[PDB]
Every structure is written in structure tokens, then in C-alpha cells.
Write a protein that binds this ligand. Structure first.
Ligand SMILES: [Cl-]
Ligand SMILES: [Cl-]
Ligand SMILES: [Cl-]
Lengths: 302, 302, 302
């Protein structure tokens, strides 16, 4: 019964839609100057096994705007499994707080925390998925362009946590994703396979122009995040996938550009695109706050 | 005049009882859904010279439920005596906050902080005593079993901060403690000596069965916490003191099992005891929050 | 238009005066027992590239007393320029919070943050200036002695961030500073030059008695803070500049003694001065809270 928020593929489509609509409603009240406290007396534990300041700040502010409290815990203050079983940690933290946000590396420790917690566990992000970023992205898209149904997003470069959640979102929100990767039409991806089985249109190609053509949103991420630790090697395999003005001109004229920050200008995207009129990267970043507020509210309800 | 909370042996019995009764009253209001703010505008500084996340979380949530504020400070942000005299630190922090919680190693730096502070200083725990854990334990006992007066607790293994405060509590709350330790009837303990002089019945033995027989509560802690840094050596001196089903069967049929977490199943206690029907370890953990709220309220009053 | 608080030399005199008067007004309401929340829903990010616990605590409590929220970020959580451009950090943090306090080493990264932020940036302190400490000092002076106009402060030892802001304050609040330094009447200081051009009377001398004579406030700081990393060398160049009873007796009979903590008794000041009846060091420390509240309120207004 507990309303965990683990991944887009573990929450029903109708509920994800309800969360998005609530995010818009709460954002409207906030921008109108309303300060409210529906979750006064609720506490969110925030466990960070790896550093993510933008995730910390966006969840912290969001919880406070709901009237709740937050407690920031590091890996050094808390590594699940170090000093006691994860079950014991989960059961004790459940006696003190009302929800637990976790940023972990591997998925398994988050799932074990959720198994034994009696309060909701929220995936702030992991190495393999990033549902909260993608909720922020879908929110941003709809704010700028209207209903996302049937639209096409084109991802440039190779997979990472954000792309994995994006293809899950294509299923849950009934849109399409074109993916231009050196891996070609043979990506071998559990996420793509799940998305296709659950309503997404996914096309995989080596060719950026083929993916971008007529697309409604062009998305990329850093060379490091996409699996190239080496700068020159990164430059090498990813330079053909760069989001530049020439690539954006192949997309729909009203296309948006998105990027889960941080970005490196001149690498995966040029200055003129990310700081140009099609970019929504800062609105996207703001929407981490507004989307995550609605996820928190959904988890805390009842 | 300042209401420091240093140790059970430094607060009068009647006041400790008042604190316990207030803990029950406030807990009842909380469970009934009331959110209140009697100490709005009060700030608790929390100084941790050594890591204790369960102590941090339980004090933080408790202070917030009183309507107050908390500030988390580490040893690296604050080691008493490093960059200025402790007197200077105490006097300045007293100008900013309304109470100071400290987790220190040795007692002396806590006492010097209290000497110079003009706000209450609270012993969150030290290497030598743990009054807040024992207030939580007495609360838990009475919630499950009624008045603690005249009851008998049996501790298995050797001394540590928790046992030291437990024997002080035996005096202050008029109960008995049987202690089964390799040290035998010759423990040589300042705490036992003080407790006996102040109303406690204390019996020390090498024999776990003698200590446990007919007892109302069986308590233990980790081999490391009880002075054995080596695992095999720990196993070696402490395995006869393990709390297992055979030992629990020697106690009163209504006996409780307690353990200041974290615990190591298969070492000082077996799975079947700590996860069985006599165990109250998670309620005990929850009661850190409720007991410490009442200590904070007592310190902050007037 | 954005109300950054960078330095005393970047804010108009009339506004600095307004801030001081508001600090007194808000302090009076607080001491009278009023708990108010004019900036409910406002969030202050606190970026510390170098440790300063007294700065953290004083800003945190102050923001909370205004009804706002704070988020503590370290250098390791945030070093401006490490993982993305400072512009990108500024623009994203501006979407989440309402003001940004920064403690940096060098001024330049604070100024770039302020260039790109769309919320006020506040200089908590830097290696080169300390406007908030000096606002606290001027507040303290006026509370104990009345209007500061035309008074004379005497600084003993060599320059540092505090002295730099003090000489700026001499201009902005129309008072005088005598500076006794081994550098003599040839200090070569951009701050002195600016202050003189903007209304301050500044006299520089090697002779402590000449600086102290008839002064209304005697101020010093640690040997390390004044540029002597070596203790024996420090003792060596600075011992003639020590603030002791003999030096205080040369000042006006009603002179105050000030020191931005921490202090080292027996080095730059003796016990009998800092713990004696002319010392206001603890009131000065308290006034970090009250002065910084008024700076926050000024930045957050409108
Ligand atoms: Cl992120
Ligand atoms: Cl503990
Ligand atoms: Cl400072």
C-alpha cells in the first residue's frame, strides 16, 4: 500500500499524470504568492550516498514549501548496510520521519530500504534511472508546448540514467523517442524493451540527423555522463552527436532543447544552442522543485 | 539555576519522573494528530564531536515537533577548545541559541561547556554515560509493563555508557539491576557504588542464568561497545553472555528484550529474540524521539 | 536593481544607516518576546568555501527569526566554477532560493556569482573584507555610546579583512580611524585611499600610544589574521601592539575594546582587557545576528 516512488515504470500512468497536473496546480498557487503548509509536521530524510547538490536543494525547498521539514544525511553519516542491516535502518528511520529520499549508486539498496520501510521511499536518482528529472522535463515540455502525447523527443549520444527514464516516460505519457547513438539500431536496452511493450514508439539510429529530423525536443547530456571518462575519447566518439545550430535546424521549427545540467558548452552542446531561444534548460532546472513537490505530496498523502 | 541535563545522577528523581510523564503526555497529543509550537523561536545547537546519526535524527525531529529550530554542527565545524577557549565558544553560542546538545567523547569538555554557557547543555551521549537512551528505555518499559518500581533488569556482557546510565536509573526510579559480566561480583564501578548509595538494588555475577532468572527485562549491547574490539576475542569472552531463546526462557514470562541499536544478530543476540515477541528494540528507538522531546522541553522551560 | 550586499563601499551611506536603524528596531521587538515571520517562504542559500561557524550560526538564526529558511552548503558540495560555469550555478540557484550568502576566499568569484544571479548575493566575509562584522561593530558602538559620528577608533596591528571594512565604515558613518602598524605612515592601502576620498579621517602610525591616545574604541585581531603565520615571529612583530591595560589607559576613559573573535589571550590582548569592563566582544558577537538580520531584510525587501 505504501506509495513509494521508485521509477516511472513502477507507478501507473494515470498516477504519473495526476502528479504532473498537481505540480502545475501547486506551482500556480506559489507564483500567485501563496505560502501554505499542507504537510506541516512531516519530515523528509534525505540520504545522499553520492553528492548531488541540485537534487538536495530542489527537494529541500520543495518540502519546505509544503510546510514540511528536511534532514540532510550523507553517505558518511549513513551508508545503508555498514553499521547495521538495511532492514534495521529502515525500521528505525520509519519511526522518526515520514518519507525517505535517497540518492544511491546501485538500485538494489534503494529497493531493500523500500522493502523494510513503513514510509515512502523516493528515488532522487541512481546511476541507472532518474525519474524526477524526467518528470521535470515532461512538465517543462507541456508548459512550453502543450500536451506531450504523440510528440517526438530525440536524444543525442549514448545512454545514461536520464535517457533510461525518458524512454520509460515515452511509454507512460504516450510519446516517441528517437535515439542517435554510436550503438546504432542494436542498443540492447531493458528500458527500450519495456517502453515498447508499454506503449512507446522508440527508434534507434547511428545518425543524428535521422533522429533529429522534425523532432519536438532535442536532448543530450555530458560526455562523462554518457560513459566516456576520457575527454579526447569523449570528444572522439561523441563529437558527431553534438547539439549545434545545424542539428537544431533539422528539428521542428518549434523544437525545444533540454539538458539535465551541468552542461559543458562546446562539447555536447554549443553556447548558441544552450543559451539561445530554443533552450529551456533553466526552466527545466526550476521544474525539479515543482515536479518533486508534487511527488512528495503524492507520497505523503492519506 | 540553568537546567542542564548532564546525567541521571545530576538531576533529581522527582524531576526525572516529571520529564517521563511529560514525555508520555506529549507523545499522546502527537499520536492524536496535534501539531503544536510551544517553543517557536527557540534554537538548539547540536554539536557532534563523534558521529551518531540516530541521536541527530531523534533530537532534530523532537525539537521541530516542539516548534523549534536546530543547527547541526560537526567536530570539524566545532571541536571545543581548538580555535578558542571553551569559555569563549560557550558564551558566544549562548548569544545565538537557546540550548546546546553535545555528543562528546570525554565528559570533561561537556562540563566545561556547561560551566560557561548561559543556556542549558544536554548530554546527547558520551563514551561513559547515555542518559537519553536510558530515559527512552524506562519510558518503553512503563508503556509496555506499567510502573518500573521494584522491577529487575538484567544486563548481559560488560559495561558501557548505556549500562552506566541504567544503574543510575535503578536508583532514580527505584528498581533493580542484575549484571552478568566476566568481571564477576568484583566490577569496581563508580556507577554501581553511586546507585547503591542512592536507592538501587544491584547484583553482579559471572553467571547469565543467575542474572536473568525471573527478570523483567533483559538488556545487552554489541561486543565492540562492551570493550572487545576484536571479533574472535569478542565472540570468545562474550559468547557465553549471548541473549538467545534459552536465556530469555529463564526470565519472567512477560520479560522484555532491549538493546540500544545498532545490533549484530548472531553475536550478542539471536534473530529469534530481537525479532521475536519479547523484543521492544524498535519502540525503544522511537522513544528516543519522545523522551528527548521532554528533556528539551524541561531544559527550555521558564 | 538587485540589492546585493557586497561591501560597505558598494552600498550608499544612507542605506547603511537605514540598515543599522532597522537592526536596532528588530532587535528591540525580539528582546520584547515577539516572534514574527515577515519573510516566511524565503530561502537563503549559505555557500561556505571556507569554514566559519560563527558566521553560519549567526546568519542561520537571523534568517529563521525573519521566518525564512536556510540551506547550508560547503565548498565540497559547492565550489563555484568546478562542475559548471559560475553563471550556470547562479542562474539555477536563483530559481530555487531568494538570496545567496557566500563566504569565499577571493572576491572575484563572489562578484561573478552576483553578476549572473537574479537574487541578492551577500558577502558573509572574504579574505579581503568583512562588512558584516563591521556593521555589527558600529551597531555595538552606538548601543553602548550613542552616535558614532566624529568618534575615533584605533586599530592595533596590521591590516586584514576587518580593518579594511572598518576604514570603509569610517567614511560611510563619518568617523575616524587611527591605525598603529609596523608599516607606519606608508601603509599603501586601496581601502584607506577610498575612505579618505569618501569622508573618513585616517591616521597611520607605527606608535600604538599615538593611535590610542584619546580614542573612543580600541580594536585588534589575532596575529595570524594580521599576516603572521609564525607564533614567535608574530609575537615578535606584534608584541609592541598588544592591547593591555597600559594601552587602554591611554584611550578615552569611556573607551570600548572590540575584537572579531576568536581571540588569543596573552597575545594580541590580555585577559584583563578582553574580560574587563571596557570589553564589548560578546555583545559585538551577538550583534552579528542582529546586524545580519537587517542586511537580510534589506536584501529581501520588495
Ligand atoms: Cl541531477
Ligand atoms: Cl545512540
Ligand atoms: Cl567571522
Amino acid at each position: 500500500g505504501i506509495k513509494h516512488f521508485i521509477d516511472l515504470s513502477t507507478v501507473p500512468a494515470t498516477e504519473l499524470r495526476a502528479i504532473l497536473e498537481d505540480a502545475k496546480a501547486r506551482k500556480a498557487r506559489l507564483k500567485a504568492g501563496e505560502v501554505e503548509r499542507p504537510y506541516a509536521g512531516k519530515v523528509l530524510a534525505m540520504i545522499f550516498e553520492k553528492l548531488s547538490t541540485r537534487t538536495r536543494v530542489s527537494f529541500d525547498v520543495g518540502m519546505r514549501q509544503l510546510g514540511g521539514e528536511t534532514i540532510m544525511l550523507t553517505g558518511s553519516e549513513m551508508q545503508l548496510g555498514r553499521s547495521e542491516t538495511i532492514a534495521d535502518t529502515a525500521k528505525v528511520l520509519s519511526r522518526y520521519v515520514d518519507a525517505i529520499m535517497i540518492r544511491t549508486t546501485a538500485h538494489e539498496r534503494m529497493l531493500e530500504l523500500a522493502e523494510y520501510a513503513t514510509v515512502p521511499v523516493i528515488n532522487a536518482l541512481t546511476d541507472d534511472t532518474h525519474p524526477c528529472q524526467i518528470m521535470a522535463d515532461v512538465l517543462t515540455y507541456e508548459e512550453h508546448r502543450g500536451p506531450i502525447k504523440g510528440k517526438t523527443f530525440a536524444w543525442m549520444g549514448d545512454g545514461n540514467n536520464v535517457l533510461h527514464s525518458l524512454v520509460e516516460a515515452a511509454a507512460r505519457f504516450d510519446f516517441n523517442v528517437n535515439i542517435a547513438t554510436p550503438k546504432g539500431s542494436e542498443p540492447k536496452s531493458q528500458y527500450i524493451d519495456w517502453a515498447r511493450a508499454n506503449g512507446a514508439g522508440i527508434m534507434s539510429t547511428t545518425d543524428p540527423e535521422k533522429a533529429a529530423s522534425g523532432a519536438d525536443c532535442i536532448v543530450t547530456d555530458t560526455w562523462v555522463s554518457m560513459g566516456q571518462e576520457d575527454h579526447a575519447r569523449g570528444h572522439n566518439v561523441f563529437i558527431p552527436y553534438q547539439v549545434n545550430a545545424n542539428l537544431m535546424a533539422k528539428a521542428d521549427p518549434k523544437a525545444l532543447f533540454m539538458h539535465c545540467l551541468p552542461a559543458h558548452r562546446g562539447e555536447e552542446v554549443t553556447d548558441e544552442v544552450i543559451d539561445g531561444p530554443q533552450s529551456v534548460v533553466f526552466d527545466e532546472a526550476e521544474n525539479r522543485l515543482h515536479a518533486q513537490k508534487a511527488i512528495l505530496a503524492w507520497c505523503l498523502q492519506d
